[PDB]
Amino acid sequence: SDAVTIRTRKVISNPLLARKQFVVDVLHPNRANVSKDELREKLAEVYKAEKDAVSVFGFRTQFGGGKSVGFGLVYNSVAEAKKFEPTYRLVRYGLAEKVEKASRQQRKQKKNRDKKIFGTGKRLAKKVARRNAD
Template identity: 50%
Template sequence: MCYSLRYCKNLSTLLGNCEKIMADGVVTIRTRKVMTNRLLCRKQMVVDILHPNRASIPKTEICERLAKMYKSTPDVITAFGFRCHFGGGRSTGFALIYDTLDYLKKFEPKYRQQRVSALFLKGYYKRERMGRKQRKERKNRMKKVRGTKKAKVGTAQKKN
């Protein structure tokens, strides 16, 4: 295979080889340090992904593969903290597999619940927020009162 385009007489051969190399994206997922956490009703593990000739893998695909490996469903799996190693081809992250969706809702932080919701459950967890200016005004009104009256200031403004 020639490496310089200047000396290469058959450019289509060179480009054809590149496409074939990039196309075979075999992904291998390995888990280690697998621990069953009975207090939080989940399995937790470190996930190593080998993905040569391919960019990082989407979390949906990771969760689906882990669901097959551990005989579960993808909606009770949270995968996070993935980092690509220098040189590419390898990523390492963390995964939690909950026993049921109820335990996931009970123990998982809200921000990770929103991520799982965005990937698989399409809006089971929807957080309603006031506008930025309303939140700032409410915060400043709460500074002017003491004790339990702070909560009343907040709820009174929500009704308006």
């Protein structure tokens, strides 16, 4: 845990996506792994991006340890880091909220059930309730 070194390779500026994209090459010669959150802290300092315009997602520790490589994004103007990021990668960082829905089984079973009716459905519910009531 002596030191970690952030080396950003292959830096390409992306004006038409309002971002900067590069290969993150971290050298952690005594750490076990490097834990993306404080990479987002440390990459914020070298690019002035307040930890919400940055994203790191693809890391792979080299065999034998001591080195890991992944990809990294740095955005302009965090409002544009929610415009262009995928939703799954925002919820890792807590910017977006994990939207709740049922499984694909229920979401498909409901559609097939709702495909049988024709219209609002509350014209038929009125006339079937009176037969059930009497």
